Amino acid sequence: KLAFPRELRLLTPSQFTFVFQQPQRAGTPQITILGRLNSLGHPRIGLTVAKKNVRRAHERNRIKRLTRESFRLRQHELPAMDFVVVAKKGVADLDNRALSEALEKLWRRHCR
RNA sequence: GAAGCUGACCAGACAGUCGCCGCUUCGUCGUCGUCCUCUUCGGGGGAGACGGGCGGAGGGGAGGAAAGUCCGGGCUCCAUAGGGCAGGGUGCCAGGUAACGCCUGGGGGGGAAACCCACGACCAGUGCAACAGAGAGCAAACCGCCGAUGGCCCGCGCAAGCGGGAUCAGGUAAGGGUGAAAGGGUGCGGUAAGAGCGCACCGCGCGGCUGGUAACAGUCCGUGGCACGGUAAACUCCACCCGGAGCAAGGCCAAAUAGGGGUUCAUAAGGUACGGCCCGUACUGAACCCGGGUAGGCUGCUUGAGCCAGUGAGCGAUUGCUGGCCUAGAUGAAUGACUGUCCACGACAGAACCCGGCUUAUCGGUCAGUUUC
RNA sequence: UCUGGGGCUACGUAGCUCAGUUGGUUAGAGCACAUCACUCAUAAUGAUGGGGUCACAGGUUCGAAUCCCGUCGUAGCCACCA
Ligand SMILES: [Ca+2]
Ligand SMILES: [Ca+2]
Ligand SMILES: [Ca+2]
Ligand SMILES: [Ca+2]
Ligand SMILES: [Ca+2]
Ligand SMILES: [Ca+2]
Ligand SMILES: [Ca+2]
């Protein structure tokens, strides 16, 4: 079961505001993750790519698609922790292989 | 035998992955002032239907540009009888829904080494360092200006005739030159060191002849050596607007603040649409808070003048007609990697109201048209 | 350290604040750091250090900036019931 329903995506800015009021910061100077412990069990994801933070509008959409595919491909493996991914300016230089391996190393250490 | 640029033109992919989205059939939860079968009222046998509502079966969802209302049009509450007309737009003529800044060519040049029209009245007022007042008025001519119409001085017995003295409205300044791009031509008695003072020749306004739906094209006839050939949203003209802001603008379910409050009222400066300009026509008010609530939704253009072949007409873009095609749009926001045959390597960007254009980042494939030998 | 359809503007006049219907003008002032009677060392009643291509080739008389359909970024706000 590796589906991707609409209910598994954020649809209200209120939840965004709540998680941004008290975010948990842990990541790298190039890519980082914010989020908090969830109570409903089913993991959730969210995407915030600022035009100022990330220029080259041909990106983001590609980045959104790639990160959504990685999330749905590794939905069950990751714990109930909510996750939101934010990429800094220096991301486009790394290719897809580098991005995939960096995300793999990142998510292979969150062992609690 | 080898090379530019536009007219247009191409951005498919699959045997497995993993699977984001409207529709029809079978049922799954609650019903219908068309109700037959019954109505004994648990609803069974329905002709037509809904909801972020699940299980199957099918067709589909990225550029020559959607960023950029940059220009014009398609569609809502609230006004709308100018002989007012301030102010922004065709400025060569004709052309399709109401539409403009797309396209055709003659008179004017670089009608091939430039595809460019943005070619409308110019002393109908008195203005910007080049401090040479020539690009608005000026001239102690610049090794020619007494080498003579008007005065003086140096050489004179009928008071004849030469050189200079940069003195004056002394032919002058473009026939010569010094920073401004030489703002016409040798010439006939221009001879007075010569200022167009009468001059065949190219060119201006005015009118006839060949064409013109239209700007004009040939000194064929005249008058003038002529008198400004040169800087336009730099006073001005309209046959089409004068309607603001735009699609997040009307419509809804058993939820309760029309809530102290402000510049004073029987004509006058509170929000006169239409004039930061005078009216025609008249809401029981007048720069704000002290948020009472809100993400549960949908038609509005989603069968929209977009497309193909065949007709009297063209230097040029056309559809009166014949089949159709039309199976791409939920508002955190629609596309991933691999075992492969042409190989033109995936450069840069985005699909949620629509169309006609923009020398654009556009490497790659040439049908029409170039000079070279 | 918050937002993809959409808008009237302020800017490359040094990166901000004042803005010129080309007043032929290497020209102004208030932030990083500086010299003079040693402010009992929290800057301007005085002289100045002035990489102010005043965005890219653009008026074929000499020109940047009022005359750009060819590009970037920040700040003044918007769905109803009366
Ligand atoms: Ca294509
Ligand atoms: Ca458009
Ligand atoms: Ca309204
Ligand atoms: Ca298609
Ligand atoms: Ca649409
Ligand atoms: Ca819609
Ligand atoms: Ca086209």
Which experiment gave this structure? Answer: cryo-EM
Query: Who's near A23: CB < 8 A, 6+ residues apart?
Result: A34, A35, A36
CB of A9 under 7 A from strand B? yes
Q: CA–CA separation, A51 vs A56, rounded Å?
A: 8
For residue A16, which nucleotide's C1' is closest to its Cα?
A: C2
Residue A63 CA distance to nucleotide B318 C1' (Å): 50
**CA A37 / ligand 6 centre spacing (Å):** 36
Residue A49 CA distance to nucleotide B248 C1' (Å): 24
Sequence ranges of the domains in chain A = 6-108
Give strand ranges (E) for A1-112.
24-27, 31-35, 45-47, 83-87
Run of H or E residues at A100: helix A96-107
Architecture of domain A6-108 in this structure: 2-Layer Sandwich (3.30)
Q: CA–CA separation, A87 vs A85, rounded Å?
A: 7
Q: CA–CA separation, A13 vs A3, rounded Å?
A: 24
Residue A69 CA distance to nucleotide B191 C1' (Å): 107
Label residue A21 exposed, middle or buried (CB < 10 Å: 0-12, 13-18, 19+). exposed
Measured N-to-C along each axis, helices A61-73 and A96-107 cross at an angle, to the nearest 10 degrees, of 40
Rg of chain A over CA atoms, in angstroms?
14
Contact A102/A56 with Cβ under 8 angstroms? no
